[PDB]
Amino acid sequence: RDEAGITGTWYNQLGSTFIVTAGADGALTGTYESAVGNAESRYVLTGRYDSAPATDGSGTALGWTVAWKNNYRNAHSATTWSGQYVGGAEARINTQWLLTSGTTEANAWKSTLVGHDTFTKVK
Amino acid sequence: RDEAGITGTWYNQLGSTFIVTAGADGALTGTYESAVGNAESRYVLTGRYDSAPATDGSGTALGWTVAWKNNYRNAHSATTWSGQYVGGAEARINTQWLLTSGTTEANAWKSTLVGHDTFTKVK
Amino acid sequence: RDEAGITGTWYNQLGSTFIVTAGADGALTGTYESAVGNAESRYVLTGRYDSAPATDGSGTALGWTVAWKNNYRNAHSATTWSGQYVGGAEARINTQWLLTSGTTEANAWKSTLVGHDTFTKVK
Amino acid sequence: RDEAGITGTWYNQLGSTFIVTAGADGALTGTYESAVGNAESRYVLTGRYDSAPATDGSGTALGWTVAWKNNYRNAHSATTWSGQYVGGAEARINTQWLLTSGTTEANAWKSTLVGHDTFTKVK
Known part of the structure; x- marks a missing residue:
């Protein structure tokens, strides 16, 4: 249980800020506050993590979702990050993400972006 | 608001069952109960959806996460589905997913599976 | 060797046409001719497939790339399909794809679309 | 045309070596020689790139495929990398990839890995 290791404030390579309680x-x-895209201020996130990970040096699997609607903007979209927490002096959460926008059925083929974010406790 | 349209029981092409309240x-x-993989019985899910979607015939963006730990099994992994709800006579949730396992850093390159699930209200 | 099974004309769910020689x-x-997006007429494709697949009923792994430049249009982008050929009465190529556009570094986070195409010998 | 910029020997974060002619x-x-996985020695690659990219500082879209069969090993799988070339003092090819294995239809849901590689001209 990395409850303590995961809870807190994280930053990714884009300058985004993820504040989480496990x-x-x-x-x-x-x-979640994104430094980029059609987003301003904080958005609600919820997710899940493996509270009893392997003890053989493997990371801790986790994921979470943001729907990009808050009191300021609605980008009609949602991102899910799937990844793993790795503890130790330079702790990191290494993720891949899927960002789906609402589209018509004719445009569904171009609904989903994919990327990768790395979160650290500093920067 | 597709609160009413999304809430309920869904089934995907693999025979999995997703029960959700929006x-x-x-x-x-x-x-979530998976018909496949290292899973048995029900797992907790949480996510988010766009509660005020576009009215121009676009779908409703949403996502959710399952960590594959419950009282029966721990598969040290988490899946996130990112997609959109499409309402109407044959309602569907069309998703793409990322399933990350906890791994050592040497094996991180093979940590994440990707796929696509389509959920309907029947079958 | 599915050289014979793969060679020919395929169609996906979007109405696109893939003509290939293995x-x-x-x-x-x-x-490749896409029924959608910033594309007109035929584009060059090249790829690879497993010429000696397992004989235990598994599919045949393969992939290919299209850069979306031809004599008519340049969409400054490339799609790669990764998937498997499955033979038998209703042969199919089941794929997932990544479509990267050229972007500035500031916009790289939104460079890549992801989707899934299913190709059949009819329609 | 980054024919000259792309042609040559590249290395990724895993210690793999990509030798390409554009x-x-x-x-x-x-x-392609992978430093990891079910692979030994060199494998054939083929792909495509945008030979007339935008001149507004955007990267050059490209992709390529390796089928993991050579004279030494057959891993019944293929990876496609989709990404962009970025030129200048620290040139890079930034990619996302899909690695599909041949599977039975019952196991197709776990056929495809996804990841991200960054290639540079040194290391």
Whole structure:
């Protein structure tokens, strides 16, 4: 249990800020602020993590979702990050993400962006 | 607001069952049972959806996460589905997913599976 | 060797047409015409396939790339399909794809679309 | 035309080596040696790139495929990299990839890995 290791404030390579609390049971709850795209201020996030990971030096699997609607803007889209927490002096959360926009059925083929974010405790 | 359209029981092409409640504010809460893989019985899910989608015939963006730990099994992994809800006589949730396993850093390159699920209200 | 099974004309769910020749050694060579997006007429494709697949009922792994430049249009982008050929009465090529556009570094995070195409010998 | 910029020997973060020749018309031809996985020695690659990219500081879209069969090993799989070439003092090819294995239809849901490689001219 990396409840303590995961809970807190994280930053990715784009300058985004992820603030999360990890629950004893597996819950992730917090806010996300993107440095890029059709986004301003904080958005609600929720997710899950493996509260009893392997002890053989493997990372801790986790994911979370942001729907890009808040009181300021609605980008009609949602991103999910799937990845793993790796603890130790330079802790990191290494993720891949899928960002789907609402589209018509004719445009569904171009609905989803894919990328990768690395979160650290500094920067 | 597709709160009413999304809330309920869904089935995908693999025979999996997703039971979800959509909150007025954007919350998704429920359980997921996979017909395949290292999984048995129900797992907690949480996510988010766009509670005020475009009215121009576009779908409703949403996502959710399952960490594959419950009282029966721990597969040290998490899947996130990112996609869109499309309403109407044959309602569907069309998704793409990322399934990350906890790994050592040497094996991180083979940590993440990707696929696509289509959920319907029947089958 | 599915050289014979793969060589020919394929159609996907979007109405696109893939014409391919499979070489004895693993080569794929042909043309692709997309029914959607910033594309008109035929584009060059090249790829590779497993010329000696498992005989245990598994599919045949393959991939290919199109750069979306031809004599009519340049969409400054390239798609790669990765997937498998499955033979038998209803032969199919089941793929997932990545479509990267050229972008500035500031916009690289939104450079890549992801989707899934299923190709059949009819429609 | 980054024919000259792309042609040559590249290295990724895993210690893999990509040797490529870019043709005037858009062709990519070469060999790939993976530092990881079920692979030994060199494998054939083929792909495509945008031979007339935008001049507004955007990268050059490209992709390529390796089928993991050579005279030493057959891993019944293929990877496609989709990405962009960025020129200048620290040139890079930034990619995302899809690695599909041949599987039975029952196991198709776990056929495809996804990741990201960054290639540079040194290391």
